[PDB]
Amino acid sequence: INYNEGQWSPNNPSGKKQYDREQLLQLREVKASRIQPEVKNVSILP
Amino acid sequence: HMKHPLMNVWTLWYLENDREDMQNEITSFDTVEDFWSLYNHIKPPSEIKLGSDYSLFKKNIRPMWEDAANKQGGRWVITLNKSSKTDLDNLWLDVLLCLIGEAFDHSDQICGAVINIRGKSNKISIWTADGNNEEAALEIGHKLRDALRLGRNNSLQYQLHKDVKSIYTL
């Protein structure tokens, strides 16, 4: 995705770990975001 | 593999209404991708049982105002005059993205967020550390109003946990 100057990115590991709403939502569809997580309670699962 | 790390570790909580014992620690995460891995596989706030809560707090802060981390703080409360599936899910998710993304200048003052599903009314709250830090509370409040496009259907009020009067109203 697009990154701002000074922002953390794979190309800029020293950048600030601050992300905008739009940037965060763009990462919602990557493969790592689609893996099922490990959770203790089940009632909140669809 | 190449995940985007978050500035803080976050823990998701789920309170199920019944007779502290009902606060349940769901899981913790510290990257953007691990957050979406969690959010994409759990019920949205519009689908959880009446009387339940979701909470997202920095690691080892419990969603309990009497705990030392929250005792001296307050909360920005968002109310919906007319509730709907769309506003509930969109507002909650947008609040979570503000938190994990560190969208506020006063990041250190944010403890977490809570959404109460209470049927005919619903509340979304952002808990801060010190209710006397006027600069931080107002900066967070103004950011919420803009980032969430709050308007006529909403009221933005800052209330001390110890208190029902409000300290600020936006």
What CATH number has the domain bearing residue B127?
3.30.760.10
**Residue B165 distance to chain A (closest CA, Å):** 32
Kindly provide the resolution of this structure in angstroms, with one decimal: 2.2
Helix axes B85-100, B134-147, angle to 10 degrees: 130
Cβ contacts of B90 within 8 Å, gap of 6 or more? none
Residue of B nearest to A34 (CA): B37
Strands (E), chain B: 5-15, 23-31, 53-58, 74-80, 110-118, 121-128, 154-160, 168-169
Chosen from A16, A24, A35 to mutate, greatest number of chain B CBs within 10 A: A24
Domain locations in chain A as residue ranges: 1-46
Exp. method: X-ray
Spatial distance between the Cα atoms of B89 and B10, rounded to a whole number of angstroms: 19
Are B103 and A34 an interchain contact pair (Cβ–Cβ within 8 Å)? no
Q: Could you tell me the two tokens for B132?
A: 């006397």
Residue of A nearest to B40 (CA): A34
Spatial distance between the Cα atoms of A9 and A7, rounded to a whole number of angstroms: 6
Q: How many structural domains are present in chain B?
A: 1
Please indicate if the annotation marks B123 as binding a ligand.
yes
Are B4 and A35 an interchain contact pair (Cβ–Cβ within 8 Å)? no
Range of the domain at B160: 1-170
Listed residue (B56, B54, B76) closest to B129, CA to CA: B76
Helix axes B32-39, B85-100, angle to 10 degrees: 160
Please indicate if the annotation marks B122 as binding a ligand.
yes
Are B40 and A34 an interchain contact pair (Cβ–Cβ within 8 Å)? yes
3-state secondary structure of B55: strand
